[PDB]
Amino acid sequence: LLWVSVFLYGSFYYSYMPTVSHLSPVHFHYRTDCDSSTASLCSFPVANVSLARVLMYGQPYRVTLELELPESPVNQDLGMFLVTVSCYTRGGRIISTSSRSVMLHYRSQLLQVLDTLLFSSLLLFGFAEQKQLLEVELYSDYRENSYVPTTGAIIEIHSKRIQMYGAYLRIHAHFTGLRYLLYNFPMTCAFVGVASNFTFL
């Protein structure tokens, strides 16, 4: 009856995750006037993103920038780099300026080799990828100003060598306690729910 257990876990996830949230894609555009003799850009990656509502008043939300990096040798030697977010008004005025410093998680060369060996099947079939997801937490608790709503955000990374695939500006209501495991640790939720439902069945 593991089929019924899987269906019950799926229904559990669907019911307890009606996430009222928005995932704005971030498109970094560069400058390209240099000689390009080295693997370094010209100017810092910048991006205007428009949210056009979700950012209403009273409810708190957590503004983050989920950032997808490759575990390339250029990224491990890059080191610390600064991420800046500037929410803007309708007329261009800045609402709230933030700043964070984010850096790639360090794993030893032997650890990388062992990861490549053991997770080889998922990497070969395209399920897994040798990438890092950094959740730059731009705002631990956001509350919108009543008079001037947030039209969008300008996001900047102050690194001329930061190899990356893409970026998301996820905004989600701060309600976490009931969904904390599902909001942060999905695989454990799947394991626990499937086991509990199978034992019940």
């Binding site: 089929w3 899987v6 269906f7 799926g10 669907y14 399920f127």
Partner: peptide, 21 residues
């Protein structure tokens, strides 16, 4: 593109076709 983002609803029925099939 992750393999389980918007297909959970499909997985609630495509997998459910295991019953008539």
């Amino acid at each position: 593109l992750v393999p389980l983002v918007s297909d959970l609803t499909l997985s609630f029925l495509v997998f459910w076709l295991c019953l008539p099939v």
